[PDB]
């Protein structure tokens, strides 16, 4: 959908230019642009791409600081789970807490999706149902999901502005592995903040998840007693996402993957 071009300003500033490959960039990027504008307005403890050039001809922004975390010959490698710097979880907790605290009404005024907590729960229910109607779901997996869905103590009572596509490759870090920015904001919306914790669980296990929760809680982010359990059930609902991708992509490999992951 776009070619990426690095370059430098006359004044020595590094830039990223997005060359559009399709004639519908504007309505297809409007949400991302709005989200980025929002995040840049309110965030001060991390960077997000700031699209100060936004047209059909061109979308361009000043290059963020730092390097993406993890893998990029074969010089730079994925994060070593045996040796994660503590500053990593602490700083990601700081960043997510700031992001998740950005005023929801400001999002509601824009074209971003904004879920109350009840709408986030209902959203998960419907996505599960849709997926099941298309592919079916194994009995034990389905029962686990339903048990989670119906468990009032698990579900958060507040929603916030999330990034929605948090992975190592989307996290900009400095030399000390302090997170300094995030990229790729296409999934930004106001919803269950738990989505932004899934990465830590999957890449770093229960320990990493706990480290992140601890930092987030300590710096003032919204916390509830079953948060960790909830994030783990949300992780257990990943096959919904795989099935969703099979449906939209029509790619057979992922239909196969979906069916295997849905335990049918």
TrEMBL record:
Residues 1-230 form the Aminoglycoside phosphotransferase domain. GDP 1 binds at residues 1-2, 18, 64. Mg(2+) 2 binds at residues 170, 184. Ca(2+) 2 binds at residues 108, 110. Ca(2+) 3 binds at residues 170, 184. Transmembrane segments: none annotated. Ca(2+) 1 binds at residue 82. PANTHER family: AMINOGLYCOSIDE PHOSPHOTRANSFERASE DOMAIN-CONTAINING PROTEIN, AMINOGLYCOSIDE PHOSPHOTRANSFERASE-RELATED-RELATED. This is Macrolide 2'-phosphotransferase II. The gene is mphB.
